[PDB]
């Protein structure tokens, strides 16, 4: 008496090619992007980079089932890149320190000549990546004053303080927000559907 599982396995033996997934696309694109950046001689690891990778990953993976496989995938992503996943998570989590602080105290601390870690990593990023912008974005969201609303006006205030290319960052962060909106719409439609 042939079982459901026998039928599924017969299918997969007859079609061995991987099944298309938007999640597979996100993971592979992020693997490629971290790889290409990281072979570059001007790439320097920083806690800002760690925050960007972790935010990018957490935000495109929030609908993924089963939820246990998120950290398994994240772990596998980091070993694939020859990176320490625990180190990224700690560095990302070290920005929690700045939760609820006002923008004025951040800007002042950056002009002081002795900003704390990981805030100081805005001067030591190395070669620029859109992941640095995602990290910056995540950091700003956790400040007080809901500083992300008129984001382009906020980024102008950081421009004379930090050496990130603010025109690139503005451009990259309008793409990321636009894309995340559309992924959220799509995911709620499939969340509605699966009922």
UniProtKB/Swiss-Prot annotation:
Residues 166-195 form a coiled coil. GO terms for biological process: photosystem II assembly. The keyword Cytoplasm does not apply. Transmembrane segments: none annotated. GO terms for cellular component: plasma membrane-derived thylakoid photosystem II. Keywords: Coiled coil. May be involved in photosynthetic membrane biogenesis. Belongs to the THF1 family. This is Protein Thf1. It comes from Thermosynechococcus vestitus (strain NIES-2133 / IAM M-273 / BP-1).
